[PDB]
Amino acid sequence: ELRVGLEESELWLRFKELTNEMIVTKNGRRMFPVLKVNVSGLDPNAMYSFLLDFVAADNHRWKYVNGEWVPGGKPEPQAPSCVYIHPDSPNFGAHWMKAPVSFSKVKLTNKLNGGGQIMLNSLHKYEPRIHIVRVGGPQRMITSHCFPETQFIAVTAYQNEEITALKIKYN
Numbered sequence: 001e002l003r004v005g006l007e008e009s010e011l012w013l014r015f016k017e018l019t020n021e022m023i024v025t026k027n028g029r030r031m032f033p034v035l036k037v038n039v040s041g042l043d044p045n046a047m048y049s050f051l052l053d054f055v056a057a058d059n060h061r062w063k064y065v066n067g068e069w070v071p072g073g074k075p076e077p078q079a080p081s082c083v084y085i086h087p088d089s090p091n092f093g094a095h096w097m098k099a100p101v102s103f104s105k106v107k108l109t110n111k112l113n114g115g116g117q118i119m120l121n122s123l124h125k126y127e128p129r130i131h132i133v134r135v136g137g138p139q140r141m142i143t144s145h146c147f148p149e150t151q152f153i154a155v156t157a158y159q160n161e162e163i164t165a166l167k168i169k170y171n
């Protein structure tokens with residue numbers, strides 16, 4: 001059985017208990033914390049690609065109102081985000097299982113852009129999600145996994161200074 005675990009959940013949970021925020025920019029900003037995933041149970045000899053996308057956790061616009069994030073009352077449907085390919089892809093199971101799979105090079109943007117960068121909507125809440133795609137073999141297979149601990153709101157600047165302080169403390 002394929003097992004997927006979040007590395008450094010301790011730390012992600014401190015961010016989550018404050019409501020996490022991630023900066024987006026026109027050129028694209030790397031994430032802190034970085035999503036790092038522990039994977040066991042792959043076929044060491046099989047070929048896999050690791051994909052990352054961001055699910056819109058709800059259909060609302062969020063605003064920081066007197067020190068608290070509060071959703072709007074005008075939901076719209078959220079078009080799915082684009083998919084980031086881990087740059088190690090494609091690779092052997094052995095490769096993926098020998099150390100945490102670290103998405104350190106994904107950049108989050110607010111503007112339709114060349115590529116690589118993943119466009120999010122500012123002030124929407126997102127739940128990171130990976131797809132593990134068995135490639136090249138006879139049977140294509142996909143295993144997906146969400147990381148609730150890693151939820152955040154996309155922001156053009158930090159609103160909650162407690163988030164600002166944690167980001168600096170741990171970076």
Ligand SMILES: CCC(=O)Nc1nc(C)cs1
Pocket residue numbers: 048049085089090133135
């Ligand atoms: C799952 C398919 C896959 O790995 N796609 C890739 N495309 C590029 C360009 C690198 S890996």
